[PDB]
Amino acid sequence: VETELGATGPLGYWDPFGFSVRNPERFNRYRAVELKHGRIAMAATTGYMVQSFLRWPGYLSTSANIKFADLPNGIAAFKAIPPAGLFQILLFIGAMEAFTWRYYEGPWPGKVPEGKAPGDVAGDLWVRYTDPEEKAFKLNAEINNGRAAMMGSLGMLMHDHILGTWVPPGF
């Protein structure tokens, strides 16, 4: 599994604990888990940075008298969302993952959907890169940006739970 995607940077194939050398047949599940984590992390990092200088106009509920511009930046912004809005967000995520972008087949654990690639959701109406060098570069860029976004989103979460902002002190 040393020649697969993600083993491109200065470290080559970097598996210290050896998850995929102990179980080489478990690489596809780990790749799907990493790809979902990376995509959620890119969305989270972009939301963290963009909510600081961009805010929607108008109200959020028009019943709890809560504005888009009144939610501060972060965890407290998710606090001030009304319970119906939280229910709708969870319904959107559940419908988005259980049926539309389905990362897992199988009864309980979820292997990989058929003979597709790990993280090969959406389908049909999605850009399919030909020219395998370009496809390999695009996929490796996706994976590496996902990993960097995981670390960044974790750091901003660590900052937000001990401050009022995700910006570290001194910045």
Binding site: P16, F17, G18, F19, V21, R22, N23
Partner: protein, 193 residues
């Protein structure tokens, strides 16, 4: 080595591997050897910590004077929680310097425990063979050769006892600190901890 041929097992959890999270079979042998070394160091540190916390909570201080002007009982007047901070700065410096030297010397030895050594077998003389450094031949483990009258089977049985006691000591020292921090968490630990 593999987690199957390892001295943890124990008779309490049915005589098999306790691992309910599947950690032992999800990683390679090098990670398991690192985990065994970390568990053994944790257990020994926790045994020392549990005995020291019990002694400091019973207010059993040394007879004499810690620093010139500072009594052992003056530091141990409060509980073990407010005790390390009452130590003079030079004494904490010397203790942590000796611990630093011990860790560096035991890690800089021939066959590392992840590269051919035995995880948890600390070398008897960590400060021997270092160029420009002379230390007496006091052994780190057993300065008195207590485990020289022991056979291989007795050594294996006492290694099993060491592992079980280290696990119990980790639970106990975390129990002591949590019982001080969160009163009423541990029913036996009354006030002076």
């Amino acid at each position: 080595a593999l987690v199957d041929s390892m001295e943890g097992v124990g008779e309490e959890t049915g005589g098999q591997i306790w691992d309910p999270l599947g950690i032992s079979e999800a990683v390679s042998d090098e990670a398991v050897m690192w985990f065994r070394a970390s568990e053994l160091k944790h257990g020994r540190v926790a045994m020392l910590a549990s005995v020291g916390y019990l002694v400091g909570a019973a207010k059993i201080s040394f007879p004499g004077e810690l620093a010139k002007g500072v009594t052992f009982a003056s530091v141990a007047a409060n509980g073990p929680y407010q005790a390390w901070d009452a130590v003079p700065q030079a004494g904490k410096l010397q203790i942590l310097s000796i611990i630093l030297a011990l860790e560096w010397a035991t890690e800089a030895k021939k066959p590392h425990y992840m590269r051919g050594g035995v995880p948890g077998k600390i070398e008897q003389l960590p400060f021997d063979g270092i160029q420009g450094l002379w230390a007496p031949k006091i052994k780190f483990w057993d300065p008195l050769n207590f485990t020289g009258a022991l056979s291989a089977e007795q050594k294996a049985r006492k290694r099993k006892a060491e592992l079980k006691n280290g696990r119990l000591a980790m639970i106990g020292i975390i129990s002591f600190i949590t019982g001080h921090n969160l009163p009423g968490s541990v029913p036996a630990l009354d006030s002076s901890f």
